[PDB]
Design a protein around this nucleic acid. Structure first.
Ligand SMILES: NC(=O)c1ccc[n+]([C@@H]2O[C@H](COP(=O)([O-])OP(=O)(O)OC[C@H]3O[C@@H](n4cnc5c(N)ncnc54)[C@H](O)[C@@H]3O)[C@@H](O)[C@H]2O)c1
Lengths: 206, 204
DNA sequence: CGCTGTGAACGCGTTCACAGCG
DNA sequence: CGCTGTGAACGCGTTCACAGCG
């Protein structure tokens, strides 16, 4: 009834497997196959899905197109979120060019404070100054991709919170302080690297 | 209890960053209470995570904890890294000036005939076919930044070449031998999690 | 007194056995 | 019968209780 956040991550993985199975022409799957491809047990797959509903067919398995649609629904992918990039350095510029956001995420703003950058035309847009967030965010942008230097993150975050942002995808190696009403999700490649260090040094534990 | 939760390692990483900051600020003494607040966990959490490895307290001396942590995390050595897939993300990573002294880029690989032989910061792009002749004793960690459809195969080549750890930036679940460590940095997953979080605020 | 270190209790996510239905 | 759906046990990871000690 109450969903652990570890399950949401696994649902994201199941949906990717379903998109792949569909691409391969597979119309039907099972908790066992789904588990095998996601490297989790069939038990876990069925438990994860049960948190939201009964999308399978007893004694048969799951119809790929159906589970796919249901998972996209649960995940909020059945809509078009408005996004923006704050910090047009190398990562931000790379993201503006990323051809993989799909139909669920649409870039609508690119902000920064550098005179050189501000004003530069980019894929589907043109860089603007951050103070224009209050006059660009409301009703148009729900999620912000935060790609500024570590020391500028928390600052940029406050400007986003005050601008009425709904969520922050944080790429900066720092814990952000935001009001509980604002969602934050971190993408930390340095932490990932350090975890590999620990893992490699502790094979037994791994 | 000596079965260190993987979730503790992530927090240790955060404690270290907090200590770096504190040291930068000129702070010398800290406590599990101040550390906790800064990491947004309880004082109980901090002390418990540290206890897994030892008794470094007295509170804590910023410089002493910082040293003990980067040691526990293996940051007291120079890891050899390589980038496989020199596209937009790969190139950005090659020029990132924030790896630190603990991580050294020693290889850049690709299959694009037009990128191989291409000079880059601290080296030149080589064909992935050269991995078996480049990884052993020089490169332990590979940053995997090739397209989704190419990731599993590239990981197979890195494994065969002797890689010890793979930092996977592709949205796929990699299959690798038990002895090869894998860590995912998945921004599309983070995006989708935010989507879910925004639609389920009560769920928090 | 104030703060650490750590067994033990506890709540929650995973595992499991089977109930439910096709 | 076969595979999904699920209530409950299990056990891992966080919280708690107190012991040590300057
Ligand atoms: N572009 C971005 O902003 C961005 C941001 C985050 C995550 N990513 C992820 O990064 C990965 C790469 O995306 P990109 O936009 O940089 O792609 P890209 O196509 O720019 O570059 C991928 C590079 O990999 C090379 N490649 C393909 N197969 C290879 C193989 N077997 N061995 C070695 N090199 C190979 C390609 O030739 C290309 O140079 C994807 O998984 C994507 O999801 C991209």
């Amino acid at each position: 009834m109450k969903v652990p956040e570890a399950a949401i991550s696994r649902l994201i993985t199941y949906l990717r497997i379903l998109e792949e199975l569909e691409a391969q022409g597979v119309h039907r799957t099972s908790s066992e196959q789904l588990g095998e491809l996601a490297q989790v047990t069939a038990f876990q797959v069925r438990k994860d899905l049960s948190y939201f509903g009964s999308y399978g067919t007893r004694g048969v398995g799951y119809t790929v197109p159906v589970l796919k649609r249901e998972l996209r629904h649960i995940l909020g992918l059945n809509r078009k979120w408005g996004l923006c990039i704050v910090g047009m350095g190398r990562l931000g510029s790379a993201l503006a060019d990323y051809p993989g956001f799909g139909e669920s995420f649409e870039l609508r703003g690119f902000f920064d404070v550098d005179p050189e950058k501000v004003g530069r035309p980019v894929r589907g847009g043109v860089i603007e100054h951050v103070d224009l967030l209050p006059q660009r965010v409301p009703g148009r942008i729900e999620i912000a991709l935060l790609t500024v230097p570590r020391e500028a993150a928390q600052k940029a975050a406050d400007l986003l919170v005050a601008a009425g942002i709904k969520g922050i995808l944080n790429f900066a190696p720092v814990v952000l302080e935001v009001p509980k009403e604002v969602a934050v999700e971190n993408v930390d490649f340095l932490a990932g690297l350090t975890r590999l260090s620990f893992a490699i040094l502790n094979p037994k534990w791994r």
